[PDB]
Amino acid sequence: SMEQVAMELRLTELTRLLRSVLDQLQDKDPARIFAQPVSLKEVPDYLDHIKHPMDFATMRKRLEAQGYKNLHEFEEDFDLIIDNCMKYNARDTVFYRAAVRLRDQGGVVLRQARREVDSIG
Numbered sequence: 340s341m342e343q344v345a346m347e348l349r350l351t352e353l354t355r356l357l358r359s360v361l362d363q364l365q366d367k368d369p370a371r372i373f374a375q376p377v378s379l380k381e382v383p384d385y386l387d388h389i390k391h392p393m394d395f396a397t398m399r400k401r402l403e404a405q406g407y408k409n410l411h412e413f414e415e416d417f418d419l420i421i422d423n424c425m426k427y428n429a430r431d432t433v434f435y436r437a438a439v440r441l442r443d444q445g446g447v448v449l450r451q452a453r454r455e456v457d458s459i460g
């Protein structure tokens with residue numbers, strides 16, 4: 340149907356916007372601490388602690404399969420990256436501090452992304 344096509348066009352547009360947001364957020368992780376899933380070989384007990392692992396590579400895979408229907412779903416996954424890290428790692432670690440910095444600096448990006456998704460519809 341024509342409606343379905345229009346829908347898929349919006350989704351494609353959303354994906355374009357979210358790809359930009361994702362690139363901007365990942366730039367706030369220069370150390371690439373969140374680039375890849377935590378290695379279950381190098382951290383074998385990780386899943387005992389964290390029930391829903393997340394990382395930028397996994398987000399990007401979902402993104403390019405057009406797997407985010409709205410900004411909320413994307414933000415959920417971004418928040419998982421940060422929140423998982425701040426649980427697993429202690430306050431005095433380079434990992435925890437990198438999550439804090441990513442969350443702080445990423446807020447600016449997500450604040451404008453929400454305005455853009457709303458405005459463009």
Ligand SMILES: CC(=O)NCc1ccccn1
Nearest residue numbers: 372373377424427428434
């Ligand atoms: C993103 C994250 O939580 N990383 C923790 C970690 C991974 C490997 C070695 C030490 N610590």
